[PDB]
Symmetry: C5
Subunit: 208 residues, 5 copies
């Protein structure tokens, strides 16, 4: 009754009484940490050169305007909110061939220090030539993820590790993973001074 009431006031205080977050700027840049858990390569189509992945995409960011003291809110350390109610980063695959499909409830975890955890399970079709998938060496494909409309001066993309998490990879998949990495890259365009950041998902795989 008290625990339940304190949360209704907390969400209210952050979401109603406080004017919300309009996004990162040059003066107030934002670090977004990114990491992948690869669950299944579902299909590799050699007549269109599309491959279908199911993965979990972990997204982590921190905000002052989502900080609070648990002492003023009944020891409440964390809460759940719909991703629609808050700002989320516009991380996008740069070479998908169909719109991403979301497999999970679009819900994020907000902790008292202002950090936000958002992990949507997704199915992506993307550009990939599976030539060699039927051999010892397998095939190698790559896809880039990054912000659609922010430079590296507004959203800094970062990984916690270069190793894609394969500890939940489906053991009875048509395809087995020889290796899977996630590398931060800095890209410039000749028009412009800003750096642009993406994370390169490289997967090497073969028929099992």
């Amino acid at each position: 009754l008290h625990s339940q009431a304190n949360l209704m006031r907390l969400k209210s205080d952050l979401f109603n009484r406080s004017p919300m977050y309009p996004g990162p700027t040059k003066d107030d840049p934002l670090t977004v940490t990114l990491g992948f858990t690869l669950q299944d390569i579902v299909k590799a189509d050699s007549s269109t050169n599309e491959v279908d992945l199911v993965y979990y995409e972990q997204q982590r960011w921190k905000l002052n305007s989502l900080m609070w003291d648990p002492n003023e809110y009944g020891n409440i350390t964390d809460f759940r909110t719909s991703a629609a109610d808050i700002w989320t980063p516009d991380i996008t695959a740069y070479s998908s061939t169909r719109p991403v499909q979301v497999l999970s409830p679009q819900i994020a975890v907000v902790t008292h220090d202002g950090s936000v955890m958002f992990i949507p399970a997704q199915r992506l079709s993307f550009m990939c030539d599976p030539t060699g998938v039927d051999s010892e060496e397998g095939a190698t494909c790559a896809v880039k993820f990054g912000s659609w409309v922010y430079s590296g001066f507004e959203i800094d993309l970062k990984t916690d590790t270069d190793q894609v998490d394969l500890s939940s990879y489906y053991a009875s998949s048509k395809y087995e993973i020889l290796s899977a990495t996630q590398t931060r890259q800095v890209q410039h365009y000749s028009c412009c001074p800003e750096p642009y950041i993406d994370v390169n998902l490289v997967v090497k795989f073969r028929e099992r």
Copy 2:
């Protein structure tokens, strides 16, 4: 026509629960919520051995109880229950953990609410999931499994339960391409090294073969 206010009793109750009283914010560590899950498997529609995807049609029965949805029937003209759209109330975020396509809803998104604050929600769903159908064309059949759980709440917040570990097969389609050899729904508690909380799932395991 003066039962008109049994309609108005239903209108009043709905105000007193939704409009007068604050939003149910979901469960917390101090205010945990038991959710009972059960499955009625209606059909294995397709088994795709080129992608290792199998498609099921089932009813997913969900049931939880909230104090904030309780009322005295005598205070509302002896009304036992009502219906609301699932959009208009909090519902548990139960998710298959190995789906390959977004879940497709086959039934109207309506929940039943009872005077003791109990809520019943039974969406019919079509699900594609990760499954190797090898051996479906033999006596022994294929065995496949899919885990269901909350996406964002631990066992400290959502106490996921079952009433029985036997999947309800009594309205399983008699002319399905696939006959069911067995269907179990097993609750599983897991602990990780990082974290104090238990993590609960319900494992749905189906042994099945091509109808002979």
Copy 3:
């Protein structure tokens, strides 16, 4: 001179939706009779590899509410109007053995008449559980699918038919499948747990390949 009749309709619509409380749904104390019927237009596809059959049909739903009654005399002799089916309560009639979500072919609009009647006839495409074995035989294949409220008992929503004959008079003459018979039959059950009756309408179709 037709500025006034437009005004009367605006006034009527307002009086029923804005100035009165809307219909909250049926109860045990205030039950609702819903009449159901089917117009079978086409059997599109019969998949013997997954045991699904695809139908296009019109689903006639009719019910009456006191809260939607008016005197035509009070509103420039207007006897009916049209409304979007999302602005009003509609019954939760569902196919009990569909395999994919229903696809709506028609504009979601209902007809409301001055005696409180609502007429709602969506055109739909349905995939449902069906074994078409014998479809090229003389006897044909036989398939069945039940329709009823998802969340209301017989004591709350009473399902009714006007006829057991499915309307076959617009059945597509050059379909892949000819209809040998199509019936719609109200059935009643009681479950072991409870005293309430449960109603469904059984759409039974016998069909075979057109030669």
Copy 4:
């Protein structure tokens, strides 16, 4: 400057300061003219008897509540409005087998005489037996269009011509058109006094040489 401002004032006046048209009635019937531009026959499926067409469906009607004198609003003669913000006619294919797919932005054109022009590009699957499509005589198929919920006492459906517009039919289509007509038909049902109108699109087509 000025031009924008006059546009905003006009749309306000029609949409906010005047009550909008609530739909046609028996006492206030409405003429809708309908016409087709056939772009392409994409697919003929003989295992299900379905054909897919792409076409432009031209719809036109005229409303007193959308008239204005151009001198009253800085010489503005027309504007555009999302089709969701105005009443539009419920014209449906009577024999589609899948929900019709919209290909163009849902924007209508309103002119000072109160006439509305709405031309959605659409992909349609409808019931059609393509037998004989590979012979010289071709296959013949037909689909009816009409209001779903209004009789001919409420919406008077008309055409401007019975000849379908073939001037932008895809020149490299899998199928060539032999003829395409659109014909107004008036029915009567024993149940009721009102007349019922539809427009019947009849297409004769065959595989290209």
Copy 5:
């Protein structure tokens, strides 16, 4: 800490543009709008020779400039640009004239508004359009065209422009099933015999063959 001021600055800017003074209501004959259109071709995914449809992935670049979106950076803590959801602003109704399926959008629907009042919006899209792939498996390839333009505005209302007649091929997928022989984007002034006013489109001509 002074990041609170730039956040406050941004919010007042957005507030002053979206709350004080309404929509730009669209272009008129008296106030016509220039829209600059460009294409980044990324992939020819498939060429169905059974239906004569071809599927493209590309980035469509759209530029326009409005006085109603213009500001002095000095009054807003030197903010020179921001991001908006494309829904919260007017955008041009640029359509493919010969699509066979609704365009599918692959990127988030966000635009970039700069202080000079110019808006930049670049949707990634997958398009199915009318194309005959005959000759694709020969050395000289197949050629297909699709026109893009406004659906409801004449050239007196929207002036469609390009910066170059060469499609950007620098991000074209190197392992596609199809290689690009050439890709041009040409601004065309059409005359319809009903009407004196001109109509503008951008014609995307792609010459391609099997890699394969």
